[PDB]
Amino acid sequence: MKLLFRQLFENESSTFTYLLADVSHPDKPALLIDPVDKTVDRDLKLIDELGLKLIYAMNTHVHADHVTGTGLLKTKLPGVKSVISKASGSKADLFLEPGDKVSIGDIYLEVRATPGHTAGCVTYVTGEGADQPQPRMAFTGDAVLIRGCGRTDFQEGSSDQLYESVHSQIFTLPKDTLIYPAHDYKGFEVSTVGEEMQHNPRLTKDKETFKTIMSNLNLSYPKMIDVAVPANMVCGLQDVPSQA
Amino acid sequence: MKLLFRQLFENESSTFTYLLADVSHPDKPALLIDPVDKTVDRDLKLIDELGLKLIYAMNTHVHADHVTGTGLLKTKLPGVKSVISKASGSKADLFLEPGDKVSIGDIYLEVRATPGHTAGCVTYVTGEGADQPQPRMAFTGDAVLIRGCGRTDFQEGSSDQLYESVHSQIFTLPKDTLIYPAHDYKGFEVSTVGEEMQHNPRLTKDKETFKTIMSNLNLSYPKMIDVAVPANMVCGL
Ligand SMILES: [Fe+2]
Ligand SMILES: [Fe+2]
Numbered sequence: 001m002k003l004l005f006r007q008l009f010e011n012e013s014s015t016f017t018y019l020l021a022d023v024s025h026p027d028k029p030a031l032l033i034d035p036v037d038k039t040v041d042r043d044l045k046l047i048d049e050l051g052l053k054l055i056y057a058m059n060t061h062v063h064a065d066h067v068t069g070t071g072l073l074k075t076k077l078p079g080v081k082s083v084i085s086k087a088s089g090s091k092a093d094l095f096l097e098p099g100d101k102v103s104i105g106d107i108y109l110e111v112r113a114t115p116g117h118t119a120g121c122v123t124y125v126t127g128e129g130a131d132q133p134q135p136r137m138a139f140t141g142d143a144v145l146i147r148g149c150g151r152t153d154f155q156e157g158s159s160d161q162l163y164e165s166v167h168s169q170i171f172t173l174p175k176d177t178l179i180y181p182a183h184d185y186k187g188f189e190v191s192t193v194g195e196e197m198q199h200n201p202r203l204t205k206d207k208e209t210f211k212t213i214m215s216n217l218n219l220s221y222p223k224m225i226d227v228a229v230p231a232n233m234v235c236g237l238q239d240v241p242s243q244a
Numbered sequence: 245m246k247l248l249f250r251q252l253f254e255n256e257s258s259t260f261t262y263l264l265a266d267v268s269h270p271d272k273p274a275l276l277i278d279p280v281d282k283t284v285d286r287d288l289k290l291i292d293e294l295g296l297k298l299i300y301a302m303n304t305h306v307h308a309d310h311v312t313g314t315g316l317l318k319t320k321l322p323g324v325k326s327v328i329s330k331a332s333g334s335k336a337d338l339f340l341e342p343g344d345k346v347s348i349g350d351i352y353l354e355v356r357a358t359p360g361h362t363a364g365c366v367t368y369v370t371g372e373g374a375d376q377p378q379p380r381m382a383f384t385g386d387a388v389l390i391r392g393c394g395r396t397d398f399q400e401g402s403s404d405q406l407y408e409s410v411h412s413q414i415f416t417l418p419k420d421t422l423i424y425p426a427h428d429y430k431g432f433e434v435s436t437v438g439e440e441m442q443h444n445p446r447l448t449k450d451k452e453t454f455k456t457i458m459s460n461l462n463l464s465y466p467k468m469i470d471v472a473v474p475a476n477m478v479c480g481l
Contacts, residue, residue: 008433009433011431042431186286187286188250188290189250189251189253
């Protein structure tokens, strides 16, 4: 295994997309996590410059803040498959269950179910096998953010469920495991399991304190959810053939 | 030596600030590269959470797009020293010459003179040695951006000088060396020397073509330069 890894940012929605590839493999097979429609051309230009073969375009969950790039990526690289959890209820080429593994050459990602922000959230974690990246890397979606977590008042979320998911599926990973979230609003880019267990002001509270604090934040209505969720439930696809 | 490394982003100016610390030393000594005034409180809070001792607040160059956080950091944390090139002509606690080293515990950076965007630009490269980061990391300021570079028509810059700086100081490093620029406007965060030598749209041309390309750019007047340069020449104070 030889990992090529890039974190990419979409400034309108503050979203991180992740590119992973096994560049030891003759085809340089690659995947994207949480690609955004707006940045598809950027992403494809980068994949071409680096000579990668994009196998999968995956989502951690159904996004409320942007439109998935997975559909457009399919319109543009025939052969790429979209991937999302079965639990999300969304359309995709491939559905994931907890415990599934996704492979790109010799590199693999384990799928952990981490619902709470939505019912469909998963966390992708690089494999624990002997030849895999060290430290492990966890792509936590909106379940754990750096020094925070996603809201739980829409998309069938639950604070109780989020707390249990994080403590059972993420904080059980080795402390040096890197945390790569789907969003960040403070200019931060990475954390670690150990660092979040020490410093995350949400998820280091006891369960009932976390639930109380969450319930009272008085967050505004999500500005894009009425557009983004329907679009993302159909893989970001259109119902008319593309023009031009 | 054990390197703790973070890249931090300031959205108003699209600036990257870099935190480096040697967490194997009993003080957990740290430095910041290109800190911004707006994000001083954030940077201090992170430094406090991680239990680090801020030693240096350094600039790659005199910034035209934001006001340096060096002066505010020195105010809040007496004892912190600001650092900048001697060639920049700006005020700082410590001036650097080409070939100088800056150390925090067992971690050190080499200073390479890379003027062209400005007369004072330097690139900080993590040091050579088995106890240093592998691959090496080059903090290139605005001399080399990911698939780009800064403009050369202000701050006593020069396209010819920028080309020579990049080719002699940056493209001579091992190809796997990481490039961490001071800004990005496309959502990219890192590149490598080998990638830029292959794919940088302007710096891969020959010198005269590079010069011609840079002269032909259609750019607006720098939006902050008459506030930022004066402030940054006096350490933000
Ligand atoms: Fe979300
Ligand atoms: Fe600059």
